[model samples]
Target: GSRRIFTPHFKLQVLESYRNDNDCKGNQRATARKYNIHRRQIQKWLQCESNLRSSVANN
Candidate 1:
């Protein structure tokens, strides 16, 4: 089996939106729509390793 991987930029973009108090607003569906991604997909991305902040925090 293979797993789909997103570009770092895309991941960061989604993370930024996820962290947004206004956009997220507890509405993952709208958040995904705003970013042109499937809601389930966005959920998966959010559940992933979260490398975006990991690098910043570790550095």
Candidate 2:
């Protein structure tokens, strides 16, 4: 599969809404579908956020 480039502005735009509420608060799969992005991407971003948060707290 070919990879597409995402700009920092676009990444923030995509993640902004994704950070709001829980996926359970609505239909996450459907939301991902609407965004034309994989749900796993969201999951990965969240995991990254978790790691960053923990690392920050440890320092």
Candidate 3:
């Protein structure tokens, strides 16, 4: 199966929503469901957290 490409903007939003809010509160599982993606994708994005922060902040 081919994975859809997510833009840096979207990635940053996901990280912001997932990490900075009490909605899920570290519950990556729910975050995945919320975004209609696999848990692995969330973990993958989290690993590149610094990049997303910088990528967006460098705006």
Q: Each model's C-alpha lDDT?
A: 0.66, 0.53, 0.75
Instruction: Give residue 38's error in model 1 in angstroms.
Output: 0.6
User: Residue 59 error for model 3, in Å?
Assistant: 7.4
| lDDT of each residue in 1-59, candidate 1, tens digit only | 54566665666566567667487756778777887777776677667636555744532
Poorest 10 consecutive residues by lDDT, candidate 2: 6-15
Q: Can you tell me which runs of candidate 3 are displaced by over 4 Å?
A: 57-59
> What would you estimate as the lDDT of candidate 2?
0.53
**lDDT value, candidate 3, whole model:** 0.75
TM-score of each: 0.58, 0.48, 0.75
In candidate 3, where is summed lDDT lowest over 10 consecutive residues?
16-25
Comparing 2 with 3 on lDDT, the higher-scoring candidate is: 3
lDDT of 2 by residue, 1-59 (tens): 75567543443334555656355334446546656777776566556655544444532
Number of the predicted model whose lDDT against the real structure is largest: 3
Task: Write out the backbone clash pairs for model 1.
Answer: none
Residue 42 lDDT in candidate 2: 56
